């Protein structure tokens, strides 16, 4: 599970087979109980837009994503079965405050326990 990298709050899920009229509010309400996300991303065609066909929302907890998945997986809504799946894409990169994250600033005080117990 991405060993040596351990990504932070980067939990994202792919939502397909959704109603065209389905808006962000509807999506939030549906997933609201099943782990309401802090942000919703909707794909749009720059050529025309309007339609999406793809959408991704950020979950507060990566473990909570299991709920909506096993819950809305194959679930029928409006005559359409929802298709939930784990994503793999990363959000827009931002090199600013993350600068302070450079080097093991914390890391349990540079591994206080050191190498195993004395």
């Amino acid at each position: 599970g991405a060993m040596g990298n351990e990504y932070k709050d980067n939990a994202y899920i792919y939502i397909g087979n959704l109603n065209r009229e389905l808006t962000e509010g509807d999506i939030l309400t549906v997933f609201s109980e099943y782990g309401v996300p802090v942000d919703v991303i909707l794909s749009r065609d720059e050529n025309t837009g309007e339609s999406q066909g793809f959408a991704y929302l950020k979950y507060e907890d990566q473990r909570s994503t299991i709920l909506a998945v096993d819950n809305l997986n194959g679930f029928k809504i409006g005559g359409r079965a929802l298709k939930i799946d784990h994503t793999f894409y990363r959000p827009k990169r931002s090199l600013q405050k993350y600068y302070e994250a450079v080097k093991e600033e914390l890391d349990r005080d540079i591994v206080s326990k050191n190498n195993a117990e004395k």
Binding site: L28, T29, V30, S32, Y34, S64
Partner: protein, 41 residues
């Protein structure tokens, strides 16, 4: 004791944003309702 069937472990409480609209995913949900609905013990 062997459980009758698998279910959700993390019981995350609902939020206001949920609007309070009906949202179901499994009939087993009846089990959770029964636990919450206890007037005899």
């Amino acid at each position: 004791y062997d459980k009758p069937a698998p279910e959700n472990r993390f019981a995350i409480m609902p939020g206001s944003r949920w609007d309070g609209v009906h949202r179901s995913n499994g009939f087993e949900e009846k089990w959770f309702a029964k636990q919450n609905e206890i007037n005899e013990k």
